[PDB]
Amino acid sequence: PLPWCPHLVAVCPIPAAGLDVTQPCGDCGTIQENWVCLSCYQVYCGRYINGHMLQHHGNSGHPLVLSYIDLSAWCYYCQAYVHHQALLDVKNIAHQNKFGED
């Protein structure tokens, strides 16, 4: 797990509409293990389900994705979970939608 990675720069602002932790995969409609892209904010499922986010990364090049299950961030290039100040807003807004608390 990294305290910083050179791809955190690719992280964009949380959309005005906010994040929806219960959002299904944009490709297969599944509600199990979905991730949100921190550059374009599209929701797709993880590698252990149907890997639509691995696919989205392949197509877009977008490196950082946030888990809607455990609120962790993975960098596809660095092949590691990244934790940093940059990810505080994204993780806060998501936690509030998932629980109600910060």
Partner: peptide, 14 residues
């Protein structure tokens, strides 16, 4: 040893 405390079958993200 650390089983009591790295972090629980998380594996590769994304």
């Amino acid at each position: 040893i650390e089983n009591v405390k790295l972090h629980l079958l998380r594996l590769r993200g994304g």
